[PDB]
Symmetry: D2
Subunit: 261 residues, 4 copies
């Protein structure tokens, strides 16, 4: 039989933030394979990643966001898809009372403010054209918070999620879709390190460390974290014309972790 | 150079219920196009299409379920994907007090219990094998009920949605994914007839009738209903191996209608 | 100082279903103490209660609900507050596949149908008057289903919860408030016996079985189940004029069990 | 015969922030009436009101927090109930792209960070004692965002709501309850001013302005905003010993506005 491509991103210009590790890297790679023109960002460029595809910036600062917006306008001449994948938590444990003003600022800057600053610069152009998609990568912690080290992370992600829905109400009628992808635990080099650290301090092994993390989430019905490529798959679907009626929604990819209907 | 092969359903055996029209027909068509082996059901048979593709049965009875389950075993030899698409509302207006026992029975039998009977027959075999996907097509009314004629419809869809999440908790650890697709207004011949009826009654044109439907939902930010093909696209994605980490979740396709984050 | 009663139910005529054990009994007791005129129901004649305060009926049947409706009108002369407290699960374990048609019918009749039948009979007259409150006692399982024996219980409670919100949309503009109270584990003779059966099967003590229950829920942050009187307190508040702006909402009383924001 | 003593706050020491007007003033008054020892805050004390009742401070600063925390320790000797009522939006219209850095800072500082700062100082001592209640007053916009001027307000309220749930997970096991009260539109002098502004720009009257607000929310089934005293009633119930099993939950008071189950 002959093929008709079902899902691609041909002709689309995509800005993917934080695309050098984990799900970000998998999303950059998949978008390129699906025919998108891609610009991605990070504080350091991997040697194997062609310079034309990359702009170096610290997205936790206003200056870094300005640099990325500039490169988007200059290299892409317009953007059709923005995938916000910058996020993370650097706060130590100790619960709410151990969150300093610096912790709160860091969590908000990384998980909310970069997306807000970039959208404020880039989305009005997309609206002017009358087409495009914005994907905010949130986190199941926006609904299912873990307090030990991620109280401010969860709060920042919840702000992001509601902000995204608010954006969707405004710009969906003008032809720009705005969706959220909410991952649970993603298998990354960094989370292997986490599992090893927990395993050592608990006196168990890697699988024991894995179990500690999963138990800490209330269990993952699927029994494993999501793979970077799995997150990429969902983002590519939502960015594609096969998802033209999907806007103002959050699509969870977590192996069933969130235990509510 | 080569064409993109992102998503297909080659090798999958799929039972899709209620595939004669609307999103059901679009999903049958797309699954066949993506390489699946498909069986579908009809209470009354459409004239043109082959006998092998449809089994005639009333899924709202024990007899009908048995017929469909036997046909699945005989024609497909097993099933990798069950897509439940039987549903609808025939209750008249007048609000909750105008729902007779007949109305309640009709709504629960069509929107919940057909799926329940079929899953009880077929899902245990999928669990024994250790692989597969069940898709329950719910409705945004399960969260956003419209009371005039659809109070019992909304309630039945809510039961279905929570039942689906319960199943996911049980069977996801055993290798079977269970997901929900929750549509808003889908543009079908039936809903176009509804629009026409509302238009002639309000003394407006077809576009005015569609606006009456949209306003009744509280507005659709996207500005249009979903097409049958669009619902099919989402179901195919979720049924595919590109969705291996997605279980125990409901994915809404409603153009932004549900106004909560 | 002198007292002005903050919360009472003086002058209110209340039907409280299933008011002879557990939270139902505590709610009957409290409503009487707050000055309500009360009618309650049970299948069995409770030794402690004056004849006038109760009517014997099987609310899982149509004729039973008619008996209760008829008695409500005959004895109270109308009703200002309906508290639906009939509910429970008699299904055995084994997950979804072990739910027979009898199990499904029993779960729906007990947890959804009785409320539907009684509301259809009694709420229109409250609407005609332009005042009143309906309280549907749901369950955290409507959002947090436990699949082993309570898949159909959870589904029924989810139907009830969405039905309640639909009816609130219809009747709140007409002066009747409709609210839900959603309990977690309530410490009752029934739930102590469940702890026993679990204790027996696990070969531990009784509180050992209580630990099994709490662990099975994903933990209770408060560290204990709700007391019947605590459920009564919340229902009394919501039935009172101190809750006049509260309608179409579900108030959860579960010690923090549901882990989502 | 005797009068009903259902609920009071005798013996409790309560800090209620922002008690000058609106729901804050109503909550201060009700708490005093129920027998609580109360301290409240304002940027400037209203003349004629006792000096002891108010502490003058800007809770959006580290200094202001320190001042309020020290006044709490000096005047109350500790605190049993903290009711966070500081909040509001002063952003102008124009949607997301009209939200300057000033707007985002204002919204987060007033609606999230004042409460976070104060909790960080006061909650650990409540935890050490092993009893108490924290109430975070959120907003239905945390789930139902309105984009014209309140995109950042909604986002900040969503952060607050998830933060509150995170804190509840941490401190509920230690004997401190943490709950949210989420109001819809509250009738205040400020919202009368808003209705008058909207009325003017639309060339209608006050009732027309009210209709514009209610339509902007998607309609209020009850048909009116909540009164300050109504919000106070709910906060008082939750702070009382009648709510001992309620923690980690959000109780919405909005006349049915949020249209989802
Ligand atoms: Ca820290
Ligand atoms: Ca990771
Ligand atoms: Ca889980
Ligand atoms: Ca989930
Ligand atoms: Ca009817
Ligand atoms: Ca009928
Ligand atoms: Ca059974
Ligand atoms: Ca049978
Ligand atoms: Ca009323
Ligand atoms: Ca838990
Ligand atoms: Ca502004
Ligand atoms: Cl990685
Ligand atoms: Cl970003
Ligand atoms: Cl944690
Ligand atoms: Cl992760
Ligand atoms: Cl990594
Ligand atoms: Cl190891
Ligand atoms: Cl699940
Ligand atoms: Cl493809
Ligand atoms: Cl059709
Ligand atoms: Cl046939
Ligand atoms: Cl059957
Ligand atoms: Cl079906
Ligand atoms: Cl309706
Ligand atoms: Cl037309
Ligand atoms: Cl939207
Ligand atoms: Cl809205
Ligand atoms: Cl939300
Ligand atoms: Cl009992
Ligand atoms: Cl009688
Ligand atoms: Cl009546
Ligand atoms: Cl009942
Ligand atoms: Cl009946
Ligand atoms: Cl839910
Ligand atoms: Cl219980
Ligand atoms: Cl009992
Ligand atoms: Cl909690
Ligand atoms: Cl948790
Ligand atoms: Cl009282
Ligand atoms: Cl009290
Ligand atoms: Cl005021
Ligand atoms: Cl500080
Ligand atoms: Cl505050
Ligand atoms: Cl700015
Ligand atoms: Cl501190
Ligand atoms: Cl306490
Ligand atoms: Cl929400
Ligand atoms: Cl707005
Ligand atoms: Cl005011
Ligand atoms: Cl309204
Ligand atoms: Cl409502």
């Amino acid at each position: 039989s002959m093929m008709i491509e079902f899902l691609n991103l041909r002709g689309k210009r995509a800005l993917i933030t934080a695309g050098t590790k984990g799900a970000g890297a998998a999303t950059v790679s998949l978008f390129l394979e699906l025919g998108a023109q891609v610009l991605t960002t990070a504080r350091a460029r991997p040697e194997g990643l062609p310079e034309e595809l990359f702009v170096e910036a610290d997205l936790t600062t206003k200056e870094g966001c300005a640099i990325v917006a500039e490169a988007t306008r200059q290299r892409l001449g317009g953007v059709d898809v923005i995938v916000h994948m910058l996020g993370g938590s650097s706060a130590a444990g100790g619960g709410f009372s151990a969150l300093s003003d610096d912790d709160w600022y860091n969590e908000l800057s990384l998980n909310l403010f970069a997306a807000v600053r970039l959208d404020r610069q880039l989305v009005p152009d997309m609206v002017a054209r009358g087409s495009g998609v914005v994907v905010h990568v949130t986190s199941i912690q926006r609904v299912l918070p873990l307090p030990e080290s991620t109280t401010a992370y969860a709060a920042a992600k919840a702000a992001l999620s509601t902000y995204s829905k608010a954006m969707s109400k405004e710009v969906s009628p003008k032809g720009v879709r705005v969706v959220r992808v909410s991952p649970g635990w993603i298998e990354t080099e960094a989370s292997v390190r986490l599992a090893e650290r927990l395993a050592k301090q608990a006196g168990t092994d890697l699988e024991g460390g894995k179990k500690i993390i999963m138990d800490g989430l209330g269990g993952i019905p699927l029994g494993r974290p999501a793979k970077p490529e799995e997150v990429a798959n969902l983002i590519a679907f939502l960015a594609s014309d096969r998802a033209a009626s999907i806007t103002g929604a959050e699509y969870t990819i977590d192996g069933g972790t969130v235990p509510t209907a």
